[PDB]
Amino acid sequence: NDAQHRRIFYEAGGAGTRARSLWRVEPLRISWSGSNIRWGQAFRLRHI
Amino acid sequence: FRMAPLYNLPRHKINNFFLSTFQRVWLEKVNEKTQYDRLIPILMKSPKQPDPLHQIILHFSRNALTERSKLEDDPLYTSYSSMMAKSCQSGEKTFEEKEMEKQKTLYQQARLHERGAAEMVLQMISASKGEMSPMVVETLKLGIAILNGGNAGVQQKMLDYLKEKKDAGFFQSLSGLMQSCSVLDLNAFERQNKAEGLGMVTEEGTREKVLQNDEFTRDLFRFLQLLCEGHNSDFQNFLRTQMGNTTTINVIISTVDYLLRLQESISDFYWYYSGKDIIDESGQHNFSKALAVTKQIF
Amino acid sequence: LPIQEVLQTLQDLIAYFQPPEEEMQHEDKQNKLRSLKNRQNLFKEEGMLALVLNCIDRLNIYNSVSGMAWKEILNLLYKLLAALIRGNRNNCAQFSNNLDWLISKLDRLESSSGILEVLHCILIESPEALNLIAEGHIKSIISLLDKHGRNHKVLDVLCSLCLCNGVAVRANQNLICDNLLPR
Amino acid sequence: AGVEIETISPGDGRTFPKKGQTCVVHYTGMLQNGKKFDSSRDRNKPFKFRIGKQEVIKGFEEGAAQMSLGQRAKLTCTPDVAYGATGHPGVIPPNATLIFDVELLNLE
Amino acid sequence: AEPTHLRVGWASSSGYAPYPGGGEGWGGNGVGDDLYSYGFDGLHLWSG
Amino acid sequence: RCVDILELCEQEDLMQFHYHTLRLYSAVCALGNSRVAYALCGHVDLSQLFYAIDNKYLPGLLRSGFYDLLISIHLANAKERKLMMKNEYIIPITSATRKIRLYPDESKRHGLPGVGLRTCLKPGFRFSTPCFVVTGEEHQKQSPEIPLEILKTKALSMLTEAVQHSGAHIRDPVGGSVEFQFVPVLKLIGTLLVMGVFDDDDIRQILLLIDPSVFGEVKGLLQTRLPESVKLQMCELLSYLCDCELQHRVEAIVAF
Amino acid sequence: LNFQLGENCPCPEEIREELYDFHEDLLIHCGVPERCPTTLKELISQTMIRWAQEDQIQDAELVRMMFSLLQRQYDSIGELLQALRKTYTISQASVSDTINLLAALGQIRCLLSVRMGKEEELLMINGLGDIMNNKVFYQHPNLMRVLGMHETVMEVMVDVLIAFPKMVASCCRFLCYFCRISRQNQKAMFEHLSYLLENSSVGLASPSMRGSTPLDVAASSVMDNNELALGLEEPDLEKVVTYLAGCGLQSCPMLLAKGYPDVGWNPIEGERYLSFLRFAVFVNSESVEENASVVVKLLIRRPECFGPALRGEGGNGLLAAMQGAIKISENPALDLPSQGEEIVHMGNAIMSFYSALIDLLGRCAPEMHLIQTGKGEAIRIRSILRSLVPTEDLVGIISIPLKLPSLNKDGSISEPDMAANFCPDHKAPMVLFLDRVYGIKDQTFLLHLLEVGFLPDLRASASLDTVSLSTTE
Numbered sequence A: 001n002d003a004q005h006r007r008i009f010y011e012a013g014g015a016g017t018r019a020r021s022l023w024r025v026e027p028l029r030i031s032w033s034g035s036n037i038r039w040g041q042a043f044r045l046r047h048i
Numbered sequence B: 001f002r003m004a005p006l007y008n009l010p011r012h013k014i015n016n017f018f019l020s021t022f023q024r025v026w027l028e029k030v031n032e033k034t035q036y037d038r039l040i041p042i043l044m045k046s047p048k049q050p051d052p053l054h055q056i057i058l059h060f061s062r063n064a065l066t067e068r069s070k071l072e073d074d075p076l077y078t079s080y081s082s083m084m085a086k087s088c089q090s091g092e093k094t095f096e097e098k099e100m101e102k103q104k105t106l107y108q109q110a111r112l113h114e115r116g117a118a119e120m121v122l123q124m125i126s127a128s129k130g131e132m133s134p135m136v137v138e139t140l141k142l143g144i145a146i147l148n149g150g151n152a153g154v155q156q157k158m159l160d161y162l163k164e165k166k167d168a169g170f171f172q173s174l175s176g177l178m179q180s181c182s183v184l185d186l187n188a189f190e191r192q193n194k195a196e197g198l199g200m201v202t203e204e205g206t207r208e209k210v211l212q213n214d215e216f217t218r219d220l221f222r223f224l225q226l227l228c229e230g231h232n233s234d235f236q237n238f239l240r241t242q243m244g245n246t247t248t249i250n251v252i253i254s255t256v257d258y259l260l261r262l263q264e265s266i267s268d269f270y271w272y273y274s275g276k277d278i279i280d281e282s283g284q285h286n287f288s289k290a291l292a293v294t295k296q297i298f
Numbered sequence C: 001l002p003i004q005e006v007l008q009t010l011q012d013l014i015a016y017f018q019p020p021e022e023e024m025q026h027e028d029k030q031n032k033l034r035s036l037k038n039r040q041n042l043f044k045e046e047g048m049l050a051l052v053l054n055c056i057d058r059l060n061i062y063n064s065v066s067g068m069a070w071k072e073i074l075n076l077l078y079k080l081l082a083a084l085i086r087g088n089r090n091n092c093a094q095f096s097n098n099l100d101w102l103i104s105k106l107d108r109l110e111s112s113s114g115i116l117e118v119l120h121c122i123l124i125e126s127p128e129a130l131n132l133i134a135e136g137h138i139k140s141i142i143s144l145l146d147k148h149g150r151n152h153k154v155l156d157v158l159c160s161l162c163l164c165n166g167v168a169v170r171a172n173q174n175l176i177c178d179n180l181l182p183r
Numbered sequence D: 001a002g003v004e005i006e007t008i009s010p011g012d013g014r015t016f017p018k019k020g021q022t023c024v025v026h027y028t029g030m031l032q033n034g035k036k037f038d039s040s041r042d043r044n045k046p047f048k049f050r051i052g053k054q055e056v057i058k059g060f061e062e063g064a065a066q067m068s069l070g071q072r073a074k075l076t077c078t079p080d081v082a083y084g085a086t087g088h089p090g091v092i093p094p095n096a097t098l099i100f101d102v103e104l105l106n107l108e
Numbered sequence E: 001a002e003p004t005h006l007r008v009g010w011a012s013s014s015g016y017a018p019y020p021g022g023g024e025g026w027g028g029n030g031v032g033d034d035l036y037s038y039g040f041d042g043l044h045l046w047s048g
Numbered sequence F: 001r002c003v004d005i006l007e008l009c010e011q012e013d014l015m016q017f018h019y020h021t022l023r024l025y026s027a028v029c030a031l032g033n034s035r036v037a038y039a040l041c042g043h044v045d046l047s048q049l050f051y052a053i054d055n056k057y058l059p060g061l062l063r064s065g066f067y068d069l070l071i072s073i074h075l076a077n078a079k080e081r082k083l084m085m086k087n088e089y090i091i092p093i094t095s096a097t098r099k100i101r102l103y104p105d106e107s108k109r110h111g112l113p114g115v116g117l118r119t120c121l122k123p124g125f126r127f128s129t130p131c132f133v134v135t136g137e138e139h140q141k142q143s144p145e146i147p148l149e150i151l152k153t154k155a156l157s158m159l160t161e162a163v164q165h166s167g168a169h170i171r172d173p174v175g176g177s178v179e180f181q182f183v184p185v186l187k188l189i190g191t192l193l194v195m196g197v198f199d200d201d202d203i204r205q206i207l208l209l210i211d212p213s214v215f216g217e218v219k220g221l222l223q224t225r226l227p228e229s230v231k232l233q234m235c236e237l238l239s240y241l242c243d244c245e246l247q248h249r250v251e252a253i254v255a256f
Numbered sequence G: 001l002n003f004q005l006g007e008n009c010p011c012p013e014e015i016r017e018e019l020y021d022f023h024e025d026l027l028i029h030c031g032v033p034e035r036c037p038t039t040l041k042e043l044i045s046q047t048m049i050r051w052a053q054e055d056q057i058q059d060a061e062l063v064r065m066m067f068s069l070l071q072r073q074y075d076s077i078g079e080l081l082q083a084l085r086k087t088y089t090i091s092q093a094s095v096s097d098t099i100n101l102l103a104a105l106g107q108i109r110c111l112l113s114v115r116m117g118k119e120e121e122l123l124m125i126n127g128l129g130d131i132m133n134n135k136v137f138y139q140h141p142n143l144m145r146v147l148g149m150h151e152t153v154m155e156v157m158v159d160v161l162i163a164f165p166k167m168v169a170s171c172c173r174f175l176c177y178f179c180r181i182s183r184q185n186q187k188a189m190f191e192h193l194s195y196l197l198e199n200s201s202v203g204l205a206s207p208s209m210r211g212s213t214p215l216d217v218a219a220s221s222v223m224d225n226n227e228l229a230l231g232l233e234e235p236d237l238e239k240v241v242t243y244l245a246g247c248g249l250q251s252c253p254m255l256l257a258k259g260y261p262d263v264g265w266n267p268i269e270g271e272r273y274l275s276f277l278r279f280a281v282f283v284n285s286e287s288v289e290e291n292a293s294v295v296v297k298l299l300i301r302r303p304e305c306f307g308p309a310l311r312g313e314g315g316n317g318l319l320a321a322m323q324g325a326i327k328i329s330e331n332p333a334l335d336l337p338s339q340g341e342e343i344v345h346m347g348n349a350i351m352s353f354y355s356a357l358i359d360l361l362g363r364c365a366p367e368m369h370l371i372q373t374g375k376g377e378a379i380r381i382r383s384i385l386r387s388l389v390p391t392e393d394l395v396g397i398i399s400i401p402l403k404l405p406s407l408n409k410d411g412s413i414s415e416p417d418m419a420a421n422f423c424p425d426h427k428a429p430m431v432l433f434l435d436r437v438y439g440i441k442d443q444t445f446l447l448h449l450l451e452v453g454f455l456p457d458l459r460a461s462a463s464l465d466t467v468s469l470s471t472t473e
């Protein structure tokens, strides 16, 4: 509801255990997408 | 000033003085010799079904495994852990004599580590969370008692428990305990000297303020030594990088850090006494305690 | 709203917050308890308790102005709330602010049992909740005894109100004695 | 008065309690609905009170004053002369009439 | 510690059947504790 | 309408409700709420409590509830006050203080624990009879009064008869189980012991019921196969006896 | 009683035989050295071990009870010692008083398992009052320490700590009296100093509660006891310095709620912390050098502990601050709360704060012998103190005229209020500070000080020597 949830912060203290700080690294590929990520590889960060 | 002889006071005040003296002189010496002396053999003595000692150890393990935030005081654990430690701590030579002493020590230790005391020691050190208390002291003494001489079986049991369980609380508590260890401080020593000079008699706690909890420090580092005793490569490596755990604690570096802190305190003490001609009794006492701790760390 | 999806989700969530069986070994039981408490904390932090309360309020508003399905949905919501806060001191302390809401919903016949379960969980776990219990709430519980029949879980709740983990609350004891006994 | 006395077993009809006397009486008090709330015969201990000191509720004292030695009678204490708006919490509800089966054992 | 019970009167075989133990009211049902018996205890007339 | 209480032997719903009612009674008057205890004496009185504790056909849960209710209303507060002031020994100095001896004779054989003269200072407890005709709270004084001479004799008699029917082959234990037969009586005995009601002969009888050979001048509870609840009660009694021995030693030291 | 001293011990051997025999008999009684048991210890040990061997105990509480009892069977001497440590023999004359004391103490102890309320608060207040009024409380302080009175009251206070200020006040008064009684009680209460200082900010604002706050208990713990004062740790003083610094920035919330003007700092609690630090430093007419150094270092690290006047940037000086305070006092609009018991006056509060601060600093100044011995720390501290307050400010403050009562023509005495005016109590610390620091060593300086400062005060005191004005406060 609140639009402020769209914002990204470097909040510290008690936020390393919450679930709002979990990100998923999704490569730009369907086959072998569960393989190792290389430096400079393009991906997407999804908020869980 | 011979104006208040004992025959000029009411019997109740003199009786209070008599009770204080009786506790302080006659009974205190007796208490040390006889305590739990005839109990441990009967607990180990025989009549699938666990022994009474096995049952008390399992009770302590279950209490240790339960999740909490602070290790609440437990006099029963303290008394029984002290009793077990004194059980193991039984007390040039012929080769046969030394070999028989070794065998007797191994048998006494196996009376306890075959009933789950190694795991109990590890769990109680994990459960302390890093706060010193009588339970931690008794736990370290019991671990030293069942590890003395470098007991390979107990080391294998402890390493298997720590690896299978992925117990990262044990090493967090070890790191906290090491960081809480006390070193020589000159401020308390100067305050003690000032109080002595003014005339006040320094109490035992005041004396212990200068180098505080040195017995616990030596017990902690003796335990850590006995984990690697006999060149146990598995435990020598595991104490550096705990592979498989969520978080790793380096115990070599922690010991080195405490060594540096103690070295700095000792150098400060030496700078204090460099100007003076001779070292008084208190200075020698504190130097001896610091040297004992340093020898254990080395 | 898809009723079947809501029903399946509520059943799966209630099975998700399921305490370990008492027969389990001590180490496994403790691991299960720790994981369950972690999941309860994760759900509470994301405002799932507030969402459950809002869903309950909306269902009650809808019923005030598919009856069996919605009754089942409301019962499952109460069970899910109890499963979320059961055995978790922080969740119960958070829910202590809604004692008036809970007691006000005690009256209705359908909601009385789930409300009693939730309230007993709160009283057992939250030690400060007993400090927020006033005379009106005690009278509401006693009136529940009077209007729903002789159910001994209400008496369990009253006993919980009287003694708070070894500390006696004189106000609760006096209120219960004065309002339940003389009649 | 606010107390209605109904005789059960007569006394001597001559010896009545006086000032500065202890009235050893065995009683059994119940609510107007038939719910017993007190009885000195269960405890095996007769109740003693002194007239004129206002130790007991007004209706009880007046009824015992009217009663004679060795007399068993029923006293109906209305809420005016027995608590009233505030009764014994947890025992006697507010505005409750009380009925006592009072026997005047002794006047000593 | 409870008053002795003693009532005398008439009763009807149609429905006057008191069993020992607990019954109507506070138990201790005698002659005059139902509508089939008509009793007298020296002070009151009992029926129902 | 009213039924017999013993008819609750087969009505589990009413039995559960009344058992929890007794629990609620014990709870409201908990931790020295003497006013609510006086109020409860207007609901369950001494005659009912004595009948309930003595009755043998009562269901075990109701039996336990009645024992607990008696202890709460009449006995719990005194025991708690005695337990608060138990780790300190304030001894006046008089001839009675000097008379205490470590041993009862020249043979130097241990006496019975808990038997003898006590020189430590222990404040007394005040009881008042629960009368609802008296106006004012001045009459009320701490917990309601109980005879304490009928009660302790009845407790000793009940314990004796329970022990004499403690065979493993018996098929109708009082209350439905050995737990429901022994735990209530043992709780009452421990409460009366800590309150210091039993005299030397009562303590001698209790000790003979515990172990006749050790405390001599049946087999005994300790040598009998008991559930763990009865074991907890026995452990508590033994703890009290150890406390009595320690107090005796302290008083002997002070006299010497 | 020391029988190992041989001829050194003056006890005849005939008497020593009795003690040896009693000790042997006692150790035999305590059990200290397959058979059927013959005593309680053997019975208990055999029963516990047989129960443990017969079946595996499935109840945790039963396991704990069994093994506690079994272990206690082999600790007779330890329990006997712990019992003797709490034994106390009294005289037959005090039996009634001690019975009353024990009854009150038991009533208080039994309320530690009850939720605090109005009735419970009254019960505990009355119980503490009865205990304090008891003769045995201050005739047998050792008895009070044996009974653990202070531990019980500390438990009550910890529970309360704030919707029950009266309970806290009663506990604090009791503990202050407890400390005042004997030095042993003072050393016993010294153990709670860290907790007492952690809650030192309770009840300071209310003026009528002086001596009934945790800070007052902490001060009573360390007061004219050199041994305990030397034992103060640096963080303990650091807490009080932090509270004082906070008082030096934010206005008093209670004063603002009551309507007092927002002067911008709290000159009322800061005085309290300064008084505690004064007790910490100055012991028995002789400053403690270690605590003096620590306090000065802590204060200098945080200049706001000196208040707005002594801050480096924008500071107007101590004399300017005192004159501003007097101006505030003369104007009712600037000190008293708005129109819309012991009313707090802002001007006198500011004056008292500065007087307490200067008193503390002057008591922190090094002793003369330490300076003459060549210690660098003493010279450093004296130099810091001199840099903080110049002699011009001290001499100006001492020169501020007072408002003393005057005899009216009608025959009635007009006595100015001593709670909202500059008073001689605010000049005494300056004379101290001007003396321990900035020692009077020049004849011209002494004569100037006597001409401007002291002579008008002497004249005023002489003038107030009439029959009517001589007795005024």
Ligand SMILES: Nc1ncnc2c1ncn2[C@@H]1O[C@H](COP(=O)(O)OP(=O)(O)OP(=O)(O)O)[C@@H](O)[C@H]1O
Pocket: A027, A028, A029, A030, A031, A032
């Ligand atoms: N998540 C994705 N986001 C963007 N492009 C994607 C994604 N997944 C696959 N692609 C597209 O697929 C190609 C790279 O993936 P890859 O070659 O492994 O896929 P694929 O096996 O051929 O299947 P598909 O064509 O369905 O993606 C590029 O065209 C990339 O644009």
Ligand SMILES: [Cl-]
Pocket: A024, A048
């Ligand atoms: Cl995802």
